[PDB]
């Protein structure tokens, strides 16, 4: 419950911060220069947590990742590429992971904190980035004495 209370609060901050800097750019576009707005904005940069501030910061970089036809991520000294696209008989590109199209940074942060993409805290949509290809369907066997159960094991797992 404490975690959720924070999501609400940090979202309100992230929202207000955007709304201020948005109005600041719109005032300068008309001629009026009021830096009083910027003072309230910078005031909320500190109010936002360290973790939350970096979440919104990596959001545009996050979008570019899940946009292409592949997903490049370098582990160790090499790399691990994963396909993002499966194409239908109609020729439609079905992305493996579909990202939101919010403009409100309040909604972005709220979504990133409550339901991030699969493979990211709090792992609501899954603990792994992408599903395994291929299967851990175990081979179950157990009847009679140890001899009979063994043979079944050896037979099935041949």
**Least separation, in Å, of the C-beta of 74 and another protein?**
18
Nearer to another protein, 57 or 94 (CB): 94
C-alpha dist (Å) from residue 9 to 39, 63, 106, 135: 20, 24, 10, 43
Number of neighbouring beta carbons within 10 Å of residue 20: 19
> Interface residues with another protein (CB under 8 A)?
1-3, 15-16, 18-20, 22-24, 26-27, 30, 32, 34, 36-37, 39-40, 86, 88-90, 92, 94-104, 106-107, 114-115, 117-118, 121-127, 130-131, 136
The answer to whether 130 is a known ligand-binding residue is yes
Query: Maximum CA pair distance of the chain?
Result: 89
**Least separation, in Å, of the C-beta of 78 and another protein?**
21
C-alpha dist (Å) from residue 17 to 10, 44, 119, 121: 10, 6, 28, 24
**Least separation, in Å, of the C-beta of 130 and another protein?**
6
């Amino acid at each position: 419950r404490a975690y959720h209370r924070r999501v609400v609060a940090q979202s309100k901050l992230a929202r207000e911060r955007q709304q201020l800097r948005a109005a600041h750019d719109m005032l300068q576009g008309a001629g009026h220069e009021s830096a009083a707005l910027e003072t309230l904005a910078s005031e909320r940069d500190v109010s936002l947590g360290a973790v939350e501030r970096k979440l919104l910061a990596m959001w545009p970089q996050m979008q570019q990742a899940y946009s292409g036809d592949e997903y490049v991520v370098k582990i160790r000294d090499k790399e691990i590429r994963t396909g993002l696209i499966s194409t239908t008989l109609s020729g439609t590109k079905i992305r493996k992971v579909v990202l939101p199209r919010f403009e409100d940074e309040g909604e972005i942060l709220k979504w990133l904190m409550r339901e991030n993409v699969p493979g990211s805290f709090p792992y609501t949509a899954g603990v792994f980035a992408f599903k395994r290809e291929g299967d851990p369907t175990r081979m179950f066997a157990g009847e009679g004495d140890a001899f009979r159960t063994n043979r079944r094991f050896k037979l099935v797992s041949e």
